[PDB]
Write a protein that binds this ligand. Structure first.
Ligand code: SF4
Ligand code: SF4
Ligand code: SF4
Lengths: 175, 176, 156, 115, 74, 318, 215, 75, 70
């Protein structure tokens, strides 16, 4: 019956992520953010990527954990804001969800949406793999090239991460 | 004479330092602690089984605040108020009248089981051993009204057993 | 009479279920608290009866007021007692709590803890024994056998 | 979407637990139970009060070493290549750099304050 | 001595250092190389008839070509 | 019938948790020289049933500063995710043969952490705040070392799939090629499980159970059942991961017997560890974790890199 | 709260999990013993010294009866003195074992609680058979021990002595080079001797830090 | 056996000391420790309370109450 | 000793003995007595897909062996 399920997961992703981006208190922001991260992991897992989405969900999660620790630490009100608490946040949430449902309407019941490109509005079973003989689940080797051919790239990556560590240490020390 | 503690030092022999390292690694005496606990595990436990196997007591235990009487005789109390005069929270209310013969008695002999503290001083003070601590300790009352004993409550409480109290005093009169 | 029959069976079920666990909390002012700790002694187990310590005021069933309730304590006592779910029960444990007792004629001492909270079960003795306190909890379980709440609700 | 089927069934399980918690058993007499408890004293203001933290380096340290976990996780698929010595060289360089970062902030007492 | 101030660190540096040193000397490294080259996911393609190349055989049973044999030979 | 299989996974978790609470109380009683639940019928059983029923009676209540959506949607995420960990568990052939399960274990355990955190936040009574921040502390400490030890233990033989993992657990147990790594892994998972005050600082006597100090009496069943699912969960994951069982081809019941007995003996071992050690300490948890585990773990990681590259023992990671 | 041993208001004005101030607001257990002992007599107000302390149930009685007898110029006969010494040591044993026990409860450590409270149940059996009291033996009048120990009791004390020596060796077996409890508590509560004098500490503190003093 | 089975826990009949008016039974074992010497078995319908269940303390007569709290050694 | 805890352990062990047993019994019931064919990779997926193609029912587990040789 349903077929657009990747697009529908994208719609849920954009709803939660716009309510994220409308800036309420970071508690509710993180709630909508982890909802968005989980359904984005579902998008990329259902699209063909095996582990990369579950990986990035884990990483992004741990980032949001530390972000929650610091928003408990520093930014607290006498009573923090929710989506339905203040005028401006409520207006932004309604208007963002309005633009979302309007795009849903122009994709579903119309032909073409031309805001920045002439996006072909139909279902995303196209384009897709036409049953090619993988036998090794392409993205696994596609990440496994990083230690085979990836000489210079992980050198500068680890070097910049080491510099990131000492940078955080010296900015905290510089009192 | 004194015996102080932690005069000790890490001995610097190689077998000593490698045994301290192996204890640092494997948490060996932590496993010894586990073994001690398992040695109490296979030990048989020591509880009682309450409604069926009650716990022990002593012959000198302090219970009920009941009253005795003579062999087929009068109420043994003679209203001498020594029990109130030693009663530390004054939970002994005594109003006395002589009866219709000329012999002396009471009217009202109330013990406040709330305000009582179960010294035994009214056991030690009663000149004829008329007020006695009972053996049993089961009062457990759903109201506040029904922990204020009147005289007839006390005497019906003391007629629920005497052979009990006679046995405990008969086995305990020489001591005190 | 199938309606009252089925309601009677279900009321017996839930009343058995209420008298089953009954975990209290530990308020425990003075030496009656030491007697509570010896009711947690292994010679008289409470965990034969599913009766567990639970220091939060938010999931205990009965509450044992055990000690000498003073004026500096008593509003905090009721402000613990109230934020506790609708089946709530009080065990007045000890001569201090069941009517004032040994500190009755003094300032700063609440003369009996009926002046703050209601009381289901008084257990006198200073201290109670472990045996007498256990007898009081058994009588409270028999009160929970005597509920007939849901029969009352149906016959209303 | 088989996992989505199972997630839907567990969410229905959770909602029936919510409804059997609130609606069914008995009533809900209010007016003091809603008060916040600490130990028997109504505290100042409320919570959501500015609460300083002890660790400053340890959370960002967690973040960066989680990112380096993310770099290290395709070690199983890497282990089957023709360029074996290069894989071994860059992998040892990654963990050696990671341990250099750890031991650097460990000798520069980054963790010897309010951990 | 230098050992049990923080000795799990000495244990870590020791087993790490032998993990660095140990791939210098081994009899199994080129075995790992030849195994990990000689096992393809992919397909051995044919090629044009030949200019009579004295290699690259015509039947897969023909032992002219480079096969794998040392597996069952330890 | 697929729905029937889902129901026969989510029904035994209820029975497992309730009768395991019975097991905890009675084993801990005979552990501590006293006696367990004995008066209630045959030995205990109907009283843990009564514990579940009694806790469903309790009629909970919402607090004041207690935003209802976050409040009643936190322990739902707790119980649901503590279930949905149990999808790729290879009780002999798992529910969904996913091509990877262990990073999924990591992510859903971290979701259990977040649900604990949001309950401790939106309870909004300052004690759940202190407890939630202590949970953040023991999550900062124990979602790195667990991950890299996992990378090491499946670096040797894994290839991320549990069926190939039970094939690799055939000649010798994987306890023996990695035993001290297994010691560190067991301690880290015992921390992450948030039982066992060997490494638990959430259910204090210094505070009163920092997750849900003042939550409500109703969803305590949700939280309680979620964490004991967490206990059985990581112990079953242990009993799959390191050691295992020679399964009969075309008969799985023997595999179920050996697997289940090993897993529940290690669960009794877990509770037996909880019985005997004191609580532990925030900054001492950081000190112990980092300055004891982490260099030794990295050394084991590089040594299990260098081992199959020097013994040609690389897996057939197809 | 259970870590607040008994009842103890503690206003801690902290910086977050690493403090700034602690304020021991006590007084919630205020009863009025001094006013009541003004309005009574000696023999009647003796159980306020039973009930003032509530673990050392006999030594504080010994203190009060010694105050009255040092006032009154009376030396009791020496069998009462040796029985008073005996119960002083037995009650001191009970108090130290509860101190170890409740510190174990505060720190975690759930089992030595149960072990040593079985031992303390034996102790309360001794008080039962001595005075007919579970926890508050008056039993020490000014004038000495009243209503002396009955026949067949020193057997029980002897058997308790042997078994308790074994049980306290088993407590040293359990804890005491436990790594986690040791390194849990090492460098907290340091007390210099100058401060130990002028802050008015006494007894176990002054034994426990520096000075060699014994009452 | 069903009665003693769902009574509380025990099967340890084999001493059979005495019985009393109200019908109740009193057993005393040698083999157990100090705390499980003696026990009681409550008979049913002693005041018609269906007292197979919900048994009380102080259903015991007082002479056996002194016996069962171990103040003497003989019934 | 442990004599009074083993019924709890046995009942809870059957509570962990059930789910894998019922799982594998359902999977053998769910394909006509054959095991549930897993599919890791694309190659084995296309092999199972031509399996469900050449059975006619579009149910793969029949697997029509040696009958349509001719
Ligand atoms: S001391 Fe005895 S005789 Fe005197 S008034 Fe009191 S009860 Fe009666
Ligand atoms: S035992 Fe009770 S009634 Fe008797 S003197 Fe003491 S407080 Fe008064
Ligand atoms: S009633 Fe007695 S034992 Fe209880 S608190 Fe008061 S003095 Fe202590």
């Amino acid at each position: 019956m349903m077929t657009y399920i990747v697009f529908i997961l994208s719609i849920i992703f954009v709803m939660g992520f716009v309510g994220f981006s409308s800036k309420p208190s970071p508690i509710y922001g993180g709630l909508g953010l982890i909802v968005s991260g989980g359904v984005g992991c579902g998008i990329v897992l259902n699209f063909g990527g095996s582990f990369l989405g579950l990986m990035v969900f884990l990483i992004y999660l741990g980032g949001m954990m530390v972000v929650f620790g610091y928003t408990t630490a520093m930014a607290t009100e006498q009573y923090p804001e929710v989506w339905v608490s203040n005028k401006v946040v409520l207006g932004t949430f309604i208007t963002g969800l309005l633009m979302e449902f309007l795009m849903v309407y122009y994709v579903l019941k119309d032909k073409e949406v031309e805001i920045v490109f002439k996006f072909n509005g139909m279902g995303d079973w196209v384009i897709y793999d036409t049953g090619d003989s993988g036998f090794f689940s392409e993205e696994a080797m596609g990440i496994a090239a990083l230690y085979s051919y990836g000489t210079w790239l992980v050198i500068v990556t680890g070097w910049s991460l080491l510099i990131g560590v000492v940078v955080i240490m010296e900015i905290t020390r510089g009192n | 004479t004194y015996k102080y503690v932690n005069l000790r030092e890490p001995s610097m022999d190689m077998k000593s330092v490698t045994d301290r390292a192996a204890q640092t690694l494997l948490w060996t005496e932590l496993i010894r602690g586990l073994g001690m606990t398992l040695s109490y595990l296979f030990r048989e436990p020591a509880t009682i089984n309450y409604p069926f196997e009650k716990g022990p007591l002593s012959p000198r235990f302090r219970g009920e605040h009941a009253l005795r009487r003579y062999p087929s005789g009068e109420e043994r109390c003679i209203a001498c108020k020594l029990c109130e005069a030693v009663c530390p929270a004054q939970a002994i209310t005594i109003e006395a009248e002589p009866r219709a013969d000329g012999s002396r008695r009471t009217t009202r002999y109330d013990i406040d089981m709330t305000k009582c503290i179960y010294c035994g001083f009214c056991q030690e003070a009663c000149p004829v051993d008329a007020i006695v601590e009972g053996p049993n300790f089961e009062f457990s009352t759903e109201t506040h009204e029904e922990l204020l004993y009147n005289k007839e409550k006390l005497l019906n409480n003391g007629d629920k057993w005497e052979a009990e109290i006679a046995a405990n005093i008969q086995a305990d009169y020489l001591y005190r | 009479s199938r309606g009252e029959y089925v309601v009677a069976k279900l009321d017996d079920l839930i009343n058995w279920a209420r008298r089953s666990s009954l975990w209290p909390m530990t308020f425990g002012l003075a030496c009656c608290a030491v007697e509570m700790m010896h009711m947690a002694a292994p010679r008289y187990d409470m965990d034969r009866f599913g009766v567990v310590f639970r220091a939060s005021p938010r999931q205990s069933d009965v509450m044992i007021v055990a000690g000498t309730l003073t004026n500096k304590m008593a509003p905090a006592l009721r402000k613990v007692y109230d934020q506790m779910p609708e089946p709530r029960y009080v065990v007045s444990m000890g001569s201090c709590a069941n009517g004032g007792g040994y500190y009755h004629y003094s300032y700063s001492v609440v003369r009996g803890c009926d002046r703050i909270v209601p009381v289901d079960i008084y257990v006198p003795g200073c201290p109670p024994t472990a045996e007498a306190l256990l007898y009081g909890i058994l009588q409270l379980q028999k009160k929970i056998k005597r509920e007939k709440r849901l029969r009352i609700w149906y016959r209303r | 979407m088989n996992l989505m089927i199972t997630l839907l069934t567990n969410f229905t399980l959770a909602t029936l637990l919510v409804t059997i918690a609130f609606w069914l058993p008995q009533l809900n007499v209010y007016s003091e139970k809603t008060s916040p408890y600490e130990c028997g004293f109504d505290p100042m203001g409320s919570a959501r009060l500015p609460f300083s933290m002890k660790f400053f380096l340890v959370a960002i340290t967690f973040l960066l070493f989680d990112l380096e976990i993310a770099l290290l996780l395709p070690l199983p698929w890497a282990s089957q290549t023709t360029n074996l010595n290069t894989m071994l060289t860059m992998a040892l360089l990654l963990i050696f750099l990671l341990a250099v970062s750890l031991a650097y902030e460990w000798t520069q007492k980054g963790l010897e304050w309010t951990e | 001595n230098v050992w049990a101030k923080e000795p799990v660190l000495v244990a870590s540096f020791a087993i790490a250092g032998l993990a660095v040193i140990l791939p210098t000397l081994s009899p199994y490294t080129k075995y790992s190389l030849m195994i990990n080259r000689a096992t393809p996911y992919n397909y051995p393609v044919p090629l044009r008839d030949d200019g009579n190349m004295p290699d690259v055989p015509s039947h897969p049973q023909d032992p002219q070509g480079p096969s794998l044999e040392w597996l069952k030979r330890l | 019938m697929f729905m029937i299989n889902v129901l026969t996974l989510i029904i035994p978790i209820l029975l497992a948790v309730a009768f395991l609470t019975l097991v905890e109380r009675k084993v801990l009683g005979y552990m501590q020289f006293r006696k367990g639940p004995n008066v209630v019928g045959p030995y205990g059983l109907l009283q843990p049933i009564a514990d579940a029923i009694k806790l469903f009676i309790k009629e909970p209540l919402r607090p004041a500063t207690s935003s209802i959506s976050m409040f009643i949607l936190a322990p739902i995420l707790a119980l649901t995710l503590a279930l949905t960990m149990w999808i790729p568990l290879p009780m002999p052939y798992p529910l969904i043969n996913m091509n990877l399960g262990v990073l999924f274990m990591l992510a859903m355990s971290s979701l259990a952490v977040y649900s604990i955190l949001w309950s401790g936040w939106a309870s909004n009574s300052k004690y759940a705040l202190i407890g939630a921040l202590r949970a953040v502390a023991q999550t900062i400490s124990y979602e790195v070392t667990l991950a890299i030890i996992l990378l090491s233990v499946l670096l040797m033989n894994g290839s991320f799939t549990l069926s190939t993992l039970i094939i690799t657990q055939e000649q010798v147990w994987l306890i023996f090629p990695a035993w001290p790594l297994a010691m560190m892994w067991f301690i880290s998972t015992l921390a992450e499980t948030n039982r066992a005050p060997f490494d638990l600082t959430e259910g204090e006597s210094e505070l009163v159970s920092g997750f849900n100090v003042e939550y409500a009496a109703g969803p305590f069943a949700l939280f309680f059942m979620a964490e004991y699912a967490n206990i059985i969960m990581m112990n079953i994951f242990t009993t799959t991961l390191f050691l295992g069982a020679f399964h009969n081809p075309y008969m799985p019941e023997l595999y179920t017997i050996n697997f289940t007995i090993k897993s529940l003996l290690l669960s009794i071992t877990f509770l037996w560890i909880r019985a005997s050690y004191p609580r532990f300490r925030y900054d001492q948890l950081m000190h112990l974790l980092w300055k004891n585990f982490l260099p030794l773990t990295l050394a084991l990681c590089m040594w299990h890199v260098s081992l199959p590259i020097l013994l040609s023992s690389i897996p057939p990671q197809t | 709260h259970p870590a607040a041993h008994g009842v103890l208001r503690l206003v801690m004005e902290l910086s977050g999990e690493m403090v700034r101030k602690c304020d021991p607001h006590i007084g919630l257990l205020h009863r009025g013993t001094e006013k009541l002992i003004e309005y009574k007599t000696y023999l009647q107000a003796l159980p306020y010294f039973d009930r003032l302390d509530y673990v050392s149930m006999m030594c504080n009685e010994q203190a009060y009866s010694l105050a009255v007898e040092k006032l009154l110029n009376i030396q009791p006969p020496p069998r009462a003195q040796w029985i008073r010494v005996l119960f002083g040591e037995i009650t001191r044993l009970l108090n130290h074992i509860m101190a170890v026990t409740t510190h174990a409860l505060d720190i975690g450590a759930m089992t030595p609680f149960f072990w040593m409270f079985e031992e303390r149940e034996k102790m309360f059996e001794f008080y039962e058979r001595v005075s007919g009291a579970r926890m508050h033996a008056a039993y020490v009048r000014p004038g000495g021990v009243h209503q002396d120990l009955p026949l067949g009791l020193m057997d029980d004390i002897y058997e308790f002595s042997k078994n308790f020596s074994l049980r306290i060796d088993e407590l040293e077996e359990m804890l005491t080079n436990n790594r986690i409890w040791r390194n849990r508590t090492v460098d907290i509560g340091v007390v210099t001797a100058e401060d130990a004098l002028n802050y008015g500490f006494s007894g176990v503190m002054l034994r426990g830090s520096g000075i060699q003093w014994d009452l | 056996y069903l009665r003693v089975l769902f009574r509380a826990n025990d099967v340890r009949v084999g001493t059979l000391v005495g019985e009393d008016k109200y019908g109740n039974k009193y057993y005393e074992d040698n083999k157990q420790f100090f705390g499980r010497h003696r026990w009681v078995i409550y008979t049913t319908e002693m005041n018609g309370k269906n007292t197979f269940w919900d048994v009380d303390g102080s259903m015991v007569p007082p002479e056996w109450h002194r016996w069962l709290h171990c103040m003497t050694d003989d019934p | 000793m442990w004599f009074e805890v083993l019924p709890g352990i046995a009942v809870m062990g059957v509570c962990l003995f059930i789910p894998g047993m019922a799982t594998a019994r359902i999977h053998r019931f769910s394909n006509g007595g054959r095991e549930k064919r897993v599919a890791h990779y694309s190659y084995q997926w296309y092999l199972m897909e031509r399996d469900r193609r050449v059975s006619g029912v579009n149910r793969y587990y029949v697997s029509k062996g040696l009958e349509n040789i001719d």
